[PDB]
């Protein structure tokens with residue numbers, strides 16, 4: 001009949017990953033392994049982050065920022081004066097054509113003092129921020145959130161490492177405040193009446209979409225969304241609906257994880273169904289350092305041997321973000 005099934009997205013209590021009960025951490029790791037080998041998604045619960053404040057502060061920002069402020073913060077794709085802003089800054093909507101808009105920021109430790117900024121290494125940028133007096137407390141909240149979700153992500157990486165049979169720091173040792181290329185994106189999906197057809201895509205299977213299929217450019221992705229169902233994950237039997245949960249974090253592996261595990265943990269393909277509803281999508285992309293290299297392995301093989309070439313994370317990220325724009329469009 002062409003009906004759509006619902007993806008199995010287990011809720012995993014990740015709180016043992018913050019503690020020192022090693023057996024309890026292994027039991028979390030088993031659940032991460034099972035989810036990563038199934039649909040590729042799970043909900044992290046008991047994460048310790050105040051996601052209500054995150055949603056409230058984000059909404060206040062989205063709903064009070066003016067067109068003048070958006071131009072002032074706009075990335076190079078919308079403002080030719082800002083050639084240094086390839087990643088960080090505001091991503092404008094286009095009424096009548098493009099509904100989505102967002103604000104992306106990077107490691108707050110990227111300053112003019114940082115040697116990667118001094119060296120002008122690709123993918124490193126100094127964050128841009130609105131005026132404090134026009135957006136009181138926003139930058140402080142946003143930077144605090146970066147480190148809040150950094151801490152959650154570090155614990156999740158311990159779970160992934162144990163799940164793959166490694167020591168718990170196998171990934172986290174490359175995830176550091178002084179060089180991480182991780183990013184936060186505060187995405188607004190608006191309610192619009194009428195909703196512009198030009199902002200709606202039609203999938204091959206006929207589904208109306210706001211964003212087409214993609215793998216995440218990340219090691220893992222740590223995503224908060226408001227309570228409006230929209231995501232679908234691709235399975236061999238077709239796309240399946242991911243149910244919403246505005247109290248937890250949706251977790252999945254990115255294509256760097258698929259590379260280094262020889263696809264043992266696949267990077268799930270997801271897409272965004274079109275829904276005419278005001279809502280939030282707030283991903284944290286767990287990226288490593290520019291020179292981070294994890295030696296690939298294959299958990300399926302007794303000797304764990306993989307002849308996949310080691311891939312520097314900075315090259316992976318630069319190529320990945322460009323390719324995602326080319327394939328799915330400038331967001």
Ligand SMILES: CC(C)[C@@H](NC(=O)[C@H](CS)NC(=O)CCC[C@H](N)C(=O)O)C(=O)O
Pocket residue numbers: 086087088104182183185187211214223270271272281283285321324331
């Ligand atoms: C939940 C996702 C599907 C979310 N989309 C996303 O996260 C989108 C599209 S895959 N992600 C990106 O474009 C990559 C952003 C990378 C960021 N600017 C950076 O420099 O690090 C959505 O809600 O659209």
